[PDB]
């Protein structure tokens with residue numbers, strides 16, 4: 710009767726594509742104007758490797774500045790998409806902070822977690838090399854996936870692969 714419920718949290722600095730990724734996955738639309746301060750949770754039934762499950766996506770928008778509350782939101786999460794923009798080096802640097810915040814809360818270096826380099830359709834504006842992102846993912850023992858919320862490239866992949874990590878590890 711009870712479906713598996715995979716609780717995903719989108720994290721990353723501003724403008725990297727957390728909302729665009731979420732809305733492409735959820736509604737098959739590229740949304741370019743989503744209020745930067747608007748957070749929202751999304752729930753969808755999805756057939757993961759043949760098994761009907763529910764995905765819950767918290768699309769965080771950076772507004773929770775009270776550390777105890779931010780930690781409470783992270784504690785509820787089971788897996789994390791840690792998103793940066795390949796076109797903004799500072800957003801790649803910022804991923805280290807989200808990682809530390811998650812590890813402090815989850816107390817488990819194997820917490821389901823993907824490093825997501827978004828905006829792969831802007832290769833001509835790339836500021837973060839594939840090599841250096843792959844090297845960071847290797848240091849953290851996480852997979853690195855490049856996505857485009859615009860073209861849909863690897864959007865389903867990051868959500869499904871994160872659910873597969875939640876399924877396997879929890």
Ligand SMILES: Nc1nc2c(ncn2[C@@H]2O[C@H](COP(=O)(O)OP(=O)(O)O)[C@@H](O)[C@H]2O)c(=O)[nH]1
Nearest residue numbers: 723724725726727728729740741828857858859
């Ligand atoms: N070209 C391109 N633009 C993107 C992509 N993802 C997001 N954007 C744009 O980047 C801006 C910020 O995206 P948003 O999802 O709101 O970022 P958030 O602050 O992380 O939620 C918007 O104008 C989007 O259209 C992408 O994959 N490719």
Ligand SMILES: *S(=O)(=O)c1ccc(S(=O)(=O)Nc2cccnc2OC)c2c1OCCO2
Nearest residue numbers: 746747748768769770771772773774779782
């Ligand atoms: S809550 O009232 O359900 C709530 C959810 C999300 C957000 S946020 O996404 O804007 N901020 C964050 C959520 C989780 C982790 N980190 C952040 O920002 C750093 C809220 C929020 O309550 C109000 C504030 O933001």
Ligand SMILES: [Ca+2]
Nearest residue numbers: 714715716787
């Ligand atoms: Ca669960």
Ligand SMILES: [Ca+2]
Nearest residue numbers: 727728745770
């Ligand atoms: Ca957003």
Ligand SMILES: [Ca+2]
Nearest residue numbers: 733734736737
């Ligand atoms: Ca779809």
